[PDB]
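Components:
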Amino acid sequence: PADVSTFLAFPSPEKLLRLGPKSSVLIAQQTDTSDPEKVVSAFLKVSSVFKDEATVRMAVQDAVDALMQKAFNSSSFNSNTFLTRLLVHMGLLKSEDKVKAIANLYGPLMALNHMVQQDYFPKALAPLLLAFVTKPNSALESCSFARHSLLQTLYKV
Amino acid sequence: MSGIALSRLAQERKAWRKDHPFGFVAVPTKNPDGTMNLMNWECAIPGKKGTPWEGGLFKLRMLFKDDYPSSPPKCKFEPPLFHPNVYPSGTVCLSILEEDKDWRPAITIKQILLGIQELLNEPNIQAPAQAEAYTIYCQNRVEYEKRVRAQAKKFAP
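Structure:
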């Protein structure tokens, strides 16, 4: 078996599955959703293990949904701050503070593709996400498939 | 150990007082004891006539570090302004305001304030500091200009 902390510390598809059939609930339960920065961190760690394979895709998607539903449904949660910090950590938007942008954007983009189709997702954030995913960027240009997919999905929001 | 910065700032104050662009304001704040705090200036930049920013007076704080002029001052609009190159915190981004980029000893307070004034109606869309203004600017220019005009009227002296 595994635990949420170890997973977030060293994310891997196997560890996510090892969390059990209730892994989605556990990730959300163990994340301090009162802190946008921590939600961004959890979202990126979870999506970093995304694989276009049945069991893993489902586990990642379900985890993202549990985490983001919990964060977004909080009347006090600042969704704008989440989006801004997400873009910063994905290296698509500059920041005053020093942050080490993630290396692979494949998982994050695929997780976003799923997230934006859910009812809990604030539609007001769609235009902002669309603006920064379409904006020229080397990292995005490398993950063309996932990028094109996310954009096509954003067009339907 | 800010003696070098203070020497320079004392002279920039005298130079500014002797001659500066009309409508602009740049004055050192005061310490609790009544003395001048040359490391913290309260400034104001007038909107350029003929532009959607005309009529407005935008207040900003200029903060100098102890190693000035090796480093550029930090310029922050108070309150934060709606503009692609202004962080939500209010911090303004400009090549001449970055030590790693175009900041140099040849840069004066007048050049900085004129540079920021120019940036107002001529944003650097390739390097946005906020997602909000960038998104609107790129998706609906007419709406963007509408928001800019409203903001200029809001900060009209």
